[PDB]
DNA sequence: AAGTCTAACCTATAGGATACTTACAGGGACACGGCGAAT
RNA sequence: AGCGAG
DNA sequence: ATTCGCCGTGTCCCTCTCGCTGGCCTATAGGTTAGACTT
């Protein structure tokens, strides 16, 4: 599945840093968990192997899927009704879904909405987390000076 | 259920309500005259503990047959507000507002009664506006004597809201503690010394 | 001073509105902000009176000169600010509701007057059972 | 419905934050920060999610026996209770004295 | 023991007790009724609009109509009345579900019975304005009602001191802000983290802070405060009149 | 004092009322009275009140919401249902 | 020497803060405040006739 | 034990797999039991010396 | 300086649609009610 | 909550 | 089965005075209100 010191994406966490894969004799069988820490407060997640790609481990999307996304985000046109509460639910799932390419299309819209007119308090920290995350994954994928990959996601986004 | 059922078959020729106002009507269609004469007859002609209960209710029937009181005032279509300084609201410390008990307990009685008044408005089923009605009662009890009946309102902290009625018991109503004996002016004390040369 | 008697009695709801020189209508106390009492509400000035001497709501008025004045825009009596002291509310309640002392003391003297039980008129005043007014 | 479950081991506690004489001073409350490793673990697939958790500014007694709230010096007094258990108690009744 | 008889004569025995916690009297008032069934719902909401109709039509014809025939005005009155009493067995149903979401909110502010006669009302105005012909699950559409009546009636009965009801936003919104930003961070936010955080001046935060101050009952204990809260001007002020004099 | 006049309305349950004020002023049209509803002059002006239609009502939230055809359409359903239900 | 000493129990007051639910004076040495001529005094005082 | 009422009540309305120690507690109750306790309370006492 | 004249701000009302159905001492005294003989 | 006089 | 006479049990108001110290999210119409020029 990973070997030791891999990075892994475990969503709706995101990157991810395997250490080893300890397996616990538990229930009589030695569960080959994946012992796996992240960056918001160092959580220690244990993943069996049996199931590590039912519960959502893999690995970041290389370049063919930043292209994808980049034309995803270059997409204009994206419509919406006068409410609120359709983006909100919309955003939320596929937010949770763990997805590249939905997250991005979501953010630029919600930016593009804040730009024109600005919406509220809480949509504005869910576009921070989901610019934040897309920069880690962005940064894990290329290596590119986190910073400077939010300077050029915002360059490329603002076209 | 057999309410209903009595109703919804035979409920013309006979009245049935509930609550204070289903009592007010009560007391409304009654003669204090006949049941103080009932009253005399019976002690007239009783004995033993009917005789007992017959002189107790005689006192509590001829407590108003007698004067000039009607018992019509028992039941409340209005409730008095004690003025706003007996009331106090005035801030404190740090511009803090300390207000009184009584604010709340009114508070409450106006919340009931403006929800109910709106409620019949609209029109709702009889249980929703039973209801209120019995949360306004027991409001109006809190108000008047919390701990009377029902539980004690509680304020925050889970202590008992002061009512009217806890202005007047125990030493702290205004009767053994303001009236009785006051603090006063001109006034001092201090340690003593035997003074054998005064 | 001139006392002879306290004749204490029951108080028709008549008697109740007559003392009352304004009815609040809703809960609110204190503005938010500005610190003043609401119109209708448990404070109000033209209910219970102005709560700064020689004043009114809109304070318009400010003299001593004319004193006994009500104003026009608030309606605030121009008075001592003593007088919310003594002048007293009333509140009407959209369905009659029974003095809590007559009815629960011990003994009930409603019970007493109208034959019934405690528990009886416990159950039939707080809506658990129904009574019949009248038949003929 | 028990498909998940959380637990809680290993509580540490870090330095005193300020010391006592400081507390004392500038009203500080003399208080150590307390972590916790708290446990969330789900039972209908399996998994661990171990944290470091802030359970509040914990008051720590001073050398003296002391605590220091906001400022003030306070102490604890020992509480009397009655023990938990069972109590036979004997009584004589006077309506047939038994 | 189902029809053990004796062990429902004693459930019949039990029903009618004294009781008097008004919380468990309720349980028990919406304990006699039922729950619903979406496609009855469905059946009663369309009754109810069939009565409302043909309500307004009389008051409508009610001035210059027409004569209506004996039959006609007995069916008519009757489609009314029975949908009255839809809307109102349909209350009785809804009972239960009002009553589950206002026990979310109890421990705050006022009593759980009023929260629970707030919700009530919040019903009302929900079936007063329920659409069913897409035909989805009418509490799911209330929920958003209920909870719009009850978090007005909150915010209006809060406090003894009246705040607006943009206030009482802003207030929640400060108090969840504050408790997210400590258990995040741990440390206590200073008012600028707030100011910046909403883009307003470092005032703002100060007055909202201080509305939301509750206020402190007199009556308190260590004995009440109200006895512990506070003839020079007036002797000088007659003084000096006579002065001039 | 200032030269002071009352002002004189009644209310609806016939009780004859009265309020102060100054000589110089404008004796309003309406007043709420210590009873506690509003009430007006027997003296002339008559300011025709001119009540404001009802905030609300349920025939109008239907209205929004919905026709008269279909409405119509139910309100036959139910008259043919309960026809049937008398005579058949 | 015990806690107790005179200049910490020592007061007069001839007009001092008065209470505002009722404008009887204040108590304690912390204010002005009077001396509580209680019920047992007013016996006293009546018994003098 | 409120804590754990709370932390209970929550697991209900939050999804699964999206919960992490960290929003399961809040440590508003156990704070405030102790703030509540030192201060405020019968056996807390204000030193005396 | 109130009297206009100008230009904002603030708030009671209202409105949005997956799903979710039963909370959380002691003492004296009197009045409301068990146990037994009589008609 | 603690304390002084009886 | 009701009457009357006994017991029996449950629920409630009272037990000194006086000091001192500290401690959700918008959308909109109408009400309301800030500032400024003036003769
Ligand atoms: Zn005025």
Not at chain 1, 92 to 106: F, I, Q, R, T
Not at chain 2, 70 to 86: H, N, T, W
Not at chain 7, 5 to 27: C, E, F, N, W
Request: hydrophobic residues 40%; proline residues 4%; neutral net charge.
């Amino acid at each position: 599945i990973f070997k030791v010191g891999d990075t892994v994406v475990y969503p709706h966490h995101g990157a991810a840093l395997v250490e080893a894969i300890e397996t616990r004799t538990i229930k009589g069988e030695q569960k080959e968990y994946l012992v796996l820490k992240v960056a918001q407060g160092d959580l220690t997640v244990r993943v069996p192997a049996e199931n590590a790609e039912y519960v959502g481990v893999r690995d970041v999307v290389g370049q063919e899927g930043l292209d994808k996304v980049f034309q995803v985000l270059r997409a204009p046109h994206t419509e919406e009704p006068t409410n609120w509460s359709r983006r909100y639910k919309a955003n939320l799932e596929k937010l949770a879904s763990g997805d590249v390419n939905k997250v991005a299309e979501v953010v630029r819209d919600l930016w593009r909405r804040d730009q024109e007119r600005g919406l509220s308090a809480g949509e504005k920290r869910m576009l921070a987390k989901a610019r934040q995350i897309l920069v880690g994954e962005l940064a894990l994928a290329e290596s590119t000076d986190d910073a400077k990959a939010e300077t050029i996601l915002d360059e490329v986004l603002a076209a | 259920n057999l309410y209903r059922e009595l109703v919804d078959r035979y409920g013309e020729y006979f009245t049935g309500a509930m609550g204070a106002e289903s009592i007010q009507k009560l007391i409304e269609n009654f003669d204090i005259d006949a049941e103080a004469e009932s009253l005399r007859d019976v002690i007239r002609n009783g004995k033993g503990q009917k005789k007992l209960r017959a002189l107790k209710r005689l006192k509590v029937v001829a407590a108003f047959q007698q004067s000039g009181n009607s018992p019509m005032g028992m039941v409340l279509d209005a409730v008095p507000v004690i003025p706003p300084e007996l009331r106090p609201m005035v801030q404190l410390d740090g511009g803090r507002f300390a207000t009184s008990d009584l604010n709340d307990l009114y508070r409450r009685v106006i919340n009931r009664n403006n929800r109910l008044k709106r409620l019949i408005d609209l029109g709702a089923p009889e249980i929703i506006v039973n209801n209120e009605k019995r949360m306004l009662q027991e409001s109006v009890d809190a108000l008047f004597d919390n701990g009377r009946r029902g539980r004690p309102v509680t304020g925050p902290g889970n202590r008992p809201l002061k009512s009217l009625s806890d202005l007047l018991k125990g030493k702290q109503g205004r009767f053994r503690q303001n009236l009785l004996g006051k603090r006063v002016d001109y006034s001092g004390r201090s340690v003593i010394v035997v003074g054998p040369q005064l | 001073n001139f006392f002879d008697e306290l004749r204490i009695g029951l108080a028709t709801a008549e008697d109740i509105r007559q003392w009352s020189y304004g009815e609040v209508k809703k809960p609110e106390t204190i503005n938010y902000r500005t610190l003043k009492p609401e119109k209708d509400g448990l404070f109000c000035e033209k209910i219970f009176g102005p709560t700064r001497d020689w004043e009114c709501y809109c304070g318009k008025y400010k003299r001593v000169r004319f004193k006994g004045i009500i104003c026009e825009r608030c309606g605030v009596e121009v008075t001592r600010a003593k007088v919310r002291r003594e002048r007293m509310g009333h509140i009407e309640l959209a369905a009659p509701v029974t003095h809590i002392w007559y009815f629960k003391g011990v003994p009930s003297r409603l019970g007493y007057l109208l034959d019934l039980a405690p528990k009886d008129l416990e159950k039939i005043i707080y809506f658990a059972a129904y009574v019949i007014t009248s038949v003929d | 419905s028990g498909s998940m479950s959380l637990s809680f081991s290993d509580p540490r506690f870090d330095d005193v934050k300020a010391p006592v004489d400081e507390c004392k001073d500038k009203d500080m409350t003399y208080a150590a920060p307390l972590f916790v490793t708290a446990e969330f673990i789900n039972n209908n697939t399996g998994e661990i999610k171990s944290q470091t958790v802030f359970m509040g500014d914990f008051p720590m007694m001073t050398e003296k026996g002391t605590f220091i709230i906001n400022g003030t010096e306070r102490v604890v007094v020992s509480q009397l209770v009655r023990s938990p258990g069972v109590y036979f108690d004997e009584t004589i009744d006077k309506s047939t004295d038994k | 023991e189902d029809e053990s008889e004796a062990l429902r004569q004693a459930r019949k025995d039990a029903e009618l007790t004294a009781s008097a916690d008004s919380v468990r009297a309720y349980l028990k008032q919406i304990g006699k009724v039922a729950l619903l069934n979406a496609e009855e719902e469905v059946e009663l909401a369309k009754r109810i609009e069939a009565g409302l109709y043909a309500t307004q039509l009389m008051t409508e014809l009610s001035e210059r109509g027409e004569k209506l025939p004996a039959a006609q005005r007995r069916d008519m009155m009757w489609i009314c009345r029975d949908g009255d009493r839809a809307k109102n067995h349909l209350l009785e149903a809804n009972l239960r579900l009002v009553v589950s979401l206002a026990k979310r909110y109890t421990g705050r502010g006022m009593a759980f019975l009023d929260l629970i006669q707030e919700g009530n009302l919040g019903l009302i105005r929900a079936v007063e304005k329920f659409d069913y012909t897409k035909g989805y699950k009418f509490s799911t559409y209330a929920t958003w009602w209920i909870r719009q009546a009850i978090t007005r009636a909150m915010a209006d009965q809060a406090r003894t001191i009246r705040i607006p009801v943009h206030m009482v936003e802003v207030i929640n919104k400060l108090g969840r802000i504050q408790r997210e930003l400590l258990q995040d961070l741990g440390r206590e936010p200073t008012p600028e983290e707030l100011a910046k955080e909403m883009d307003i001046t470092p005032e703002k935060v100060l007055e909202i802070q201080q509305y939301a101050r509750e206020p402190i009952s007199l009556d308190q204990t260590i004995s009440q405060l109200g006895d512990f809260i506070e003839a020079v001007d007036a002797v000088s002020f007659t003084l000096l009149q006579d002065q001039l004099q | 004092l200032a030269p002071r006049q009352i002002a004189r309305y009644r209310t609806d349950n016939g009780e004859e009322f009265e309020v102060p004020f100054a000589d110089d002023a404008e004796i309003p049209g309406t007043w709420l009275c210590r009873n506690g509803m509003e009430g007006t002059l027997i003296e002339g002006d008559l300011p025709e009140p001119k009540k404001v239609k009802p905030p609300r009502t349920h025939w109008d939230m239907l209205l929004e919401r919905r026709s008269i055809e279909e409405l119509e359409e139910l309100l036959k359903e139910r008259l043919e249902l309960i026809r049937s239900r008398r005579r058949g | 020497k015990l806690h107790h000493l005179v200049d910490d129990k020592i007061h007069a007051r001839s007009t001092g803060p008065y209470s505002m639910i009722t404008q009887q004076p204040l108590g304690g040495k912390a204010q002005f405040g009077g001396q509580r001529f209680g019920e047992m005094e007013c016996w006293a005082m009546q018994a003098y006739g | 034990s409120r804590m754990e009422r709370v932390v209970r009540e929550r697991m209900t309305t939050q999804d699964v797999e999206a919960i992490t120690p960290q929003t399961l507690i809040n440590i508003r109750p156990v704070v405030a039991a102790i703030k509540e306790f030192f201060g405020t309370s019968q056996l807390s006492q204000f030193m005396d010396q």
